[PDB]
Symmetry: none
Subunit: 171 residues, 4 copies
């Protein structure tokens, strides 16, 4: 019955993604969101960012044999959100104790000592709002950094430092 006003995702078909092989479903609503970086190249145009989208989905599939790209959603510095596993499918991104209960969104780039552009941040913040809108995320959603759920520098020092200032970031 209910769409409260969503957000605009670049379909898999658009960034030319290999078909997903995953069947494991995330149980809806989800309470946690885990933010990370791909520690890969950055892209600032819709065109390069679709390339970036497929290179990451390919390390993940052709080299680690996962069923699809690890994250549920990706984020480009071009201000757009590329669709990964989406809101419904479980997705390898932060350890087995955390993959079944959270959504993983990953900024595409390495923000160890670089900050994402205001558009990247608006992209993500608005995505979560759409999530709450469809009811795929619960309004009590808690945003957690990846370093907060496992021994990794992700999502990078300078973007980590930033997500902490968000309304939903929890201890």
């Amino acid at each position: 019955e209910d769409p409260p006003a969503c957000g605009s995702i670049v379909p898999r078909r658009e960034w030319r993604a290999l078909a997903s092989e995953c069947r494991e479903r995330l149980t809806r609503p989800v309470r946690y969101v885990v933010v990370s970086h791909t520690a890969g190249s950055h892209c600032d145009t819709p065109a390069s960012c679709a390339q970036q989208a497929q290179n990451v989905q390919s390390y993940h599939v052709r080299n680690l044999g996962w069923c699809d790209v690890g994250y549920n959603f990706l984020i480009g510095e071009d201000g757009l959100v590329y669709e990964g596993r989406g809101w419904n499918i479980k997705g390898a991104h932060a350890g087995p104790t955390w993959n079944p209960i959270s959504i993983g969104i990953s900024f595409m780039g390495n923000y160890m000592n670089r900050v994402p552009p205001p558009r990247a941040l608006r992209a993500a913040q608005n995505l979560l709002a759409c999530g709450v809108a469809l009811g795929a995320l619960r309004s009590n959603y808690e945003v957690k950094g990846h370093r907060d759920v496992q021994p990794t520098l992700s999502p990078g020092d300078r973007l980590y430092e930033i997500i902490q200032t968000w309304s939903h970031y929890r201890a």
Copy 2:
């Protein structure tokens, strides 16, 4: 926060806009939404699209002497929505009959023999969703094409073809 789930709009601050000096308030709800095309050059990256937004505004302000870019919102092929006069300051896009009752959104470029990428069309359709969500737009909002309201060759044939598709398009 543009209250609700306000679908990622690039702010005036960000595209380096000149201060609006517009004073007329839009009467709320804006039942009609008129689509047009600047009939100017187009842009596919956000960088090129900032500077394209600037161009449409200086022309409107320095040359025509208007209080600000005539459009409430400008859409780029970079798939982003650029803020102009916004949801409240009234626009200069369809003449006096329509200007005080409709919100006007323009696609950057001339769509006479060119189609806008689905990201542009997505960014537009999703911009109206944040419109309703805000109470800026009646949920039962009616989309008109420029031609429909004025003696004009815009949105451009191609873009006009498409908006007939839209569920909210009107006779």
Copy 3:
């Protein structure tokens, strides 16, 4: 015509409030209002109510060592509103999830078996109308009982039946 034309709040120095020490800021407009009750003694005179206000303030500041009384506004059965930490400061009234996105207004007294006098109710409704008139509260703001966001019998079975009857009540 249209100015503030807000109701009439008894300011801090009028009831000898110790110096606020709070520095955290609510960002307006505010979307939510959480109705609480003090669960203490009630009062029906400007004199006794200004006394009550102070007790409640001290318990919260020396006993618990907080930076000021916890609520943003206190309603008295005398028919007046006692300025709590006001429209602009983040105040401790309903957990770390709501405190930053809501206004806490406590109805001095205990309302499990007791109804507040019309005065009280109007003092509270008035205060809210006023809050919108000032752009402190979002116009479509929502009212949620204290027990609707935290484990507590607050506001009192009887007051709770009352606020549920409001147009902004929405849980």
Copy 4:
């Protein structure tokens, strides 16, 4: 190692706890213990209580949408201790400051003008004895009353006077 036999707690599972979604952790050895009361109806048979324990959790997770019942343990007039969020997971019972450094045991009942039966008191002090032996509580933990750290009536008046008596109670 030396058995530490204090365990005589009813598992989350003998009273049918819904699965918890909480994942934040207390650091052992925990220094503080906060005694609260549920302010709800009490129970005195292990059957009527397991119900009550489910009733409380239902409120916390289904209305307030919390990841699980907020207290770490619950005592009943039945003389039994109910596993809540247990010894290692951070509860939600006394606010942002206390939650991280304390355990919240809470008596199931309204002890405003009632005393809890001796068996409940025994079960509680025994429960604490447990914590120290397991190494979960510091050998010299400090008991604090719910109202001593937050604006409320808990642990109930007569029960508040009773704990003020204990040897680990502190200012």
